Design a protein around this ligand. Structure first.
Ligand SMILES: Nc1ncnc2[nH]cnc12
Ligand SMILES: Nc1ncnc2[nH]cnc12
Ligand SMILES: [Cl-]
Ligand SMILES: [Cl-]
Ligand SMILES: [Cl-]
Ligand code: NA
Ligand code: NA
Ligand code: NI
Lengths: 182, 181
């Protein structure tokens, strides 16, 4: 009983903002969940319970909203958190992967020391839309030898394809809530 | 026992010579993040320190500030509110500029997230010049929030950030300090 009520409360605490960033999009605003202590802490408790017996040895989160759920999950699971960032922020040796934007490409980096061949890695992000940044993040992990077959999200937008696209690259996706639309 | 915990924290932070230029001993908080014991210790001390302060909201600026402020907010049981680079926040915002090496940038906050009566803690990873914190403090006070505290993992006191923040009425708390710019 507790857990289905907490999911509903989580989903209710995420505001919909029409026409951001442009017209016709029904933007799903995770910041309203952040500022509700009850919703935020439930979102972390539920993700942490979900993976507590999964053998995860590390969490990776991508900058910036991903830090907000990946790092607390890491803390609750008792494992290291590893950030993936835009270029030029990480100070130690990195590798990088480029990914498609609507116009052009961008890049994500990870510290080459922070993933090893025996790691079992959980990727955590706020919101799964088309999946491009997470697909690049999976590649970075795999290039260093880490296993990544789990990724977890507060929010899934399945009509944008991101879940199907990751799930066909061998990632088992878990999302607390989902919304229709683009 | 208490200095063993801070020493444990401090030793988990790596020093990278000559990044991003020669003479700079870069203090790299990412090695603390990958040590779960150092990382949880650092959140436990920060939150313990403010446990009787009456804080009602924690503010952290993107992105490293999110790694320390949001866990602190979860431990205090209070809302987290991000301050962001422009163009990322969906609801109504206000903006403040601060200074870079070359030029200026701006931070934004949601106007609905801070209100008169709020007691706000600002948390960041590392106190350097303090330009983003001063900007953050102004955002919060323009919305009527009260902010008298800022908390950090690392202080670089040779950059003068604590003095610059005392002058705006902010008490700084840091867990460890390093020399150098
Ligand atoms: N509706 C939406 N809300 C939040 N982020 C998105 N990314 C793509 N569509 C989005
Ligand atoms: N030595 C240093 N390490 C990390 N961040 C900094 N910002 C300014 N100086 C720094
Ligand atoms: Cl982001
Ligand atoms: Cl499997
Ligand atoms: Cl940052
Ligand atoms: Na490696
Ligand atoms: Na307000
Ligand atoms: Ni499988």
């Amino acid at each position: 009983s507790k857990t289905a009520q907490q999911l509903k409360y989580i989903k209710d605490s995420i505001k919909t903002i029409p026409d951001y960033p442009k017209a016709g999009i029904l933007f799903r605003d995770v910041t309203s969940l952040l500022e509700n202590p009850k919703a935020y802490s439930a979102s972390i408790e539920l993700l942490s319970e979900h993976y507590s017996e999964s053998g995860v040895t590390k969490v990776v989160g991508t900058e910036a909203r991903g830090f907000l759920f990946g790092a607390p999950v890491a803390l609750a699971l008792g494992v290291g958190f590893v950030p993936v960032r835009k270029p030029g922020k990480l100070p130690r040796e990195t590798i990088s992967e480029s990914y498609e934007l609507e116009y052009g490409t961008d890049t994500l980096e990870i510290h080459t020391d922070s993933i090893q061949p025996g790691d079992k890695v959980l990727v955590v992000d706020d919101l799964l839309a088309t999946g491009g940044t997470i697909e690049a993040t999976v590649k970075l992990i795999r290039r260093l030898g880490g296993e990544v077959v789990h990724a977890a999200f507060i929010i899934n937008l399945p009509e944008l394809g991101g879940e199907a696209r990751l799930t066909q690259q061998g990632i088992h996706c878990y999302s607390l809530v989902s919304f229709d639309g683009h």
